[PDB]
Ligand binder design. Structure first.
Ligand SMILES: Nc1ncnc2c1ncn2[C@@H]1O[C@H](COP(=O)(O)OP(=O)(O)O)[C@@H](O)[C@H]1O
Ligand SMILES: [Mg+2]
Ligand SMILES: [Mg+2]
Ligand SMILES: [Mg+2]
Length: 421
């Protein structure tokens, strides 16, 4: 079988990495992919907005299974297109991807279907939003409805902070139609973790959970990021905690989507907040998370390709997970999240430490080496029998392949490790 992974970041590398270990697969294509990915996936110069060249390529090159990595193509219906071409593909329809694409939709669905989440309202009028902020007071969370790039959530500690954001979103339309509408919801606290699951209709197959550092600098201070590293398992969250969110959140969400003419096949991502009231939904994503995938896929014992195939056909799925833990650290470019440097030489990026994989997020091959090719560059990930073992090993390799121009956090998984004792 030929498999087509789509996307260009660290998640897609892990996908190409895992698919390549599969015994069913003759060829793995990544489109576009990136240059660190090349031992795993024959790259393909079709960009991922290129739904037509992707469909055309896959149709003509006998792709038996396409996996779609990023959410925009899904939100914009790349899946529907492949199915029109008769192509076998893993991911949600444009109708299903709405569960991530419109946060209003997901807030409303959870409400309608009694799924635990922050209390909220959604606004299209700035005046009415502001009056609601002034009624509820701060803390309060201001969320753009549509994608907005990850940089469209503001946790406001003051009403002035909230009203400012409502001004950017609604009066200035910072994010266009993405911010044409706004979710305002209650501030929740606690441990945040990712619960991803393989979903098709009402069938849910949970994956092991992960946790990431969304914040730029150590001690979790600084602007937000797209992930500065993560790890799995999450020791300080019980096994019953997870089994419970699967039954009261994830399966109900899957079933809810079916019963709204929006049946969901793909990866459903529940980012969850374990509050003093129990687990609550911060948000759904409609695909593998980044960088959650880099620490979650390697722990899967099963063949992913076999797994997806049994899911798409409607057969018994045999999903087995490894006991080993994995921990991953992001090497980011100086300036990130804000304006960052492109072109920095960072060497071979290939550690000597064993039981390590560097998944490339932003990198180009140039000069026999790698240049920085993005805000977040690499995902030094390591595996081991227990958390802190793997945690110690990552930073070993972190300290091997590190080159000037990159930074990172030294405290990944540290707070979890402590609070786990
Ligand atoms: N209600 C909330 N209470 C506390 N923190 C929140 C809330 N909503 C979001 N956050 C924080 O903001 C981040 C981004 O919000 P999220 O809803 O997950 O949207 P995005 O798709 O942009 O990631 C989260 O990962 C979490 O750390
Ligand atoms: Mg998130
Ligand atoms: Mg999201
Ligand atoms: Mg079989």
């Amino acid at each position: 079988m030929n498999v087509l992974i789509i996307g260009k970041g660290g998640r897609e590398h892990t996908l190409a990495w895992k698919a390549a270990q599969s015994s069913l697969v003759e060829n793995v294509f990544a489109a576009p992919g990136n240059d660190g990915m090349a031992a795993s996936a024959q790259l393909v110069n079709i960009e991922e907005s290129d739904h037509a060249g992707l469909v055309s390529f896959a149709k003509q090159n006998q792709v038996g299974l396409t996996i779609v990595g990023p959410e925009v193509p899904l939100i914009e219906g790349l899946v529907d297109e492949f199915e029109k071409a008769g192509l076998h593909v893993f991911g949600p329809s444009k109708a299903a991807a709405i569960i991530e694409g419109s946060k209003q939709f997901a807030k409303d669905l959870m409400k309608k279907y009694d799924i635990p989440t922050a209390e909220y309202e959604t606004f299209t009028s700035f005046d009415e939003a502001k009056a609601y902020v002034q009624e509820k007071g701060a803390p309060i969370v201001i969320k753009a409805d549509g994608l907005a790039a990850g940089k469209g959530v503001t946790v406001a500690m003051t009403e002035e902070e909230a009203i400012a954001c409502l001004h950017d979103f609604l009066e200035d339309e910072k994010f266009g139609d993405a911010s044409a509408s706004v979710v305002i919801e209650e501030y929740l606290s606690g441990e945040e973790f990712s619960l991803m699951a393989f979903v098709k209709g009402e069938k849910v197959y949970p994956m092991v959970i992960a946790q990431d550092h969304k914040r730029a600098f150590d001690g979790d201070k600084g602007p937000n990021t797209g992930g500065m590293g993560a790890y799995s398992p999450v020791p300080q969250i019980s096994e019953e905690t997870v089994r419970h969110a699967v039954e009261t959140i994830v399966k109900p969400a899957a079933k809810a989507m079916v019963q709204e003419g929006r049946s969901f096949t793909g990866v459903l991502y529940a980012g969850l907040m374990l509050t003093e009231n129990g687990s609550k939904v911060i948000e759904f994503n409609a695909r593998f998370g980044d960088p959650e995938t880099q620490v979650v896929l390697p722990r899967m014992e099963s063949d992913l390709v076999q797994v997806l195939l049994d899911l798409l056909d409607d057969k018994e799925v045999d999903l087995r997970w490894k006991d080993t833990a994995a921990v991953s650290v992001v090497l980011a470019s100086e300036g990130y999240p804000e304006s960052y440097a492109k072109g920095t030489p960072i060497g071979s990026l290939a550690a000597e430490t064993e039981q390590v994989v560097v998944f490339h997020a932003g990198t180009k091959a140039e000069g026999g080496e790698f240049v920085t090719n993005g805000g977040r560059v690499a995902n030094v990930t390591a595996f081991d029998e227990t958390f802190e073992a793997a945690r110690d090993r990552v930073y070993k390799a972190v300290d091997e392949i590190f080159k000037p121009g990159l930074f990172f956090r030294k405290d990944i998984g540290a707070r979890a490790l402590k609070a786990a004792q």
